[PDB]
Each structure stands twice: as structure tokens, then as C-alpha cells.
Amino acid sequence: KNIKIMRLVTGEDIIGNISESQGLITIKKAFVIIPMQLVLSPWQPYTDDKEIVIDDSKVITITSPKDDIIKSYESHTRVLENKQVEEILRLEKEIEDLQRMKEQQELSLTEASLQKLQERRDQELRR
């Protein structure tokens, strides 16, 4: 782990775990810092990648943060990850309940109703 802040040519403060191999650097868990108390925001809300590759020519300065900023960053990312996993569990429970309720509702149909169900299911499958 190596948490560092960088300043971009655009004028943004990015805090994240960086690796500087051969000029092309790799960033994990990048967060935009916005003052007002520090406010951490996601850098790229339009992707699901983890290792973001950026050239060193686009970063102005690369500094090491203080202890309070590191603590706040770790707490924020931990809270976000816990919220994500809790949402995953909630989704699993909801889909299980919906599946069981749909199965119970389907159990009370006549045989010709299952015939029509299949005669529309194949149409929905082909289209």
C-alpha cells in the first residue's frame, strides 16, 4: 500500500494508491478531494476498472498526505465498500423472495395455462 496525493494539469487533487513503474503510472481507488472539511468523491463514476493508467506528463506534483487525510480516506473507502456489500446482500434477498413468490403464483395454474405460458415464452425467447 502506498497512498499519495497528486495534482493534475486540469487542476484536480487525486488521492489514491499509486505505482510508478516506467513513467506510465497506475492508480487504484482514486478519489477527488474537494475542500469547503475534506470531501472525497469518486474520480471515475463512468467505469468499473481498478487500475487506471495515466502518464506522468499529466500530473503536476506528487506528494505524500498527512495522517488525518489517510485515516479519513481509509474510513471513507471502508464505509463505501460495506455499503456496497450490504446492497449486494439486500439484492440477493430481494431476488430470492421475488423468485419464491413467482413460483408460488405459478404453482396455481391449469395445464392449458402452462401451455399458453410456453407458447408465449418461446416467442419471447426468439425475440
Q: Does residue 124 bind its own copies (CB under 8 A)? A: yes
Q: Which of residues 57-116 bind its own copies (CB under 8 A)?
A: 57-58, 60-69, 81, 84-85, 87-89, 91-92, 94-95, 98-99, 101-102, 104-110, 113, 116
Cβ-contact 19, 56 below 8 angstroms: no
| CA 72/CA 43 separation, integer angstroms | 16
Give the number of residues in contact with its own copies, rule: CB under 8 A. Answer: 56
| CA 17/CA 3 separation, integer angstroms | 4
Cβ-contact 55, 24 below 8 angstroms: yes
Q: Which of residues 24-63 bind its own copies (CB under 8 A)?
A: 33, 38, 44, 46-50, 52-54, 57-58, 60-63
Site string for its own copies, 5-24 (x = CB under 8 A): x--xxxx-x-----------
Binding test (CB under 8 A) with its own copies, winner from 24, 83, 117, 122: 117
10 Å CB burial of residue 105 (0-12, 13-18, 19+) is exposed
| CA 16/CA 19 separation, integer angstroms | 10
The count of other CB atoms within 10 Å of the CB of residue 33 is 18
Q: Which residues bind its own copies (CB under 8 A)?
A: 5, 8-11, 13, 33, 38, 44, 46-50, 52-54, 57-58, 60-69, 81, 84-85, 87-89, 91-92, 94-95, 98-99, 101-102, 104-110, 113, 116-117, 120-121, 124
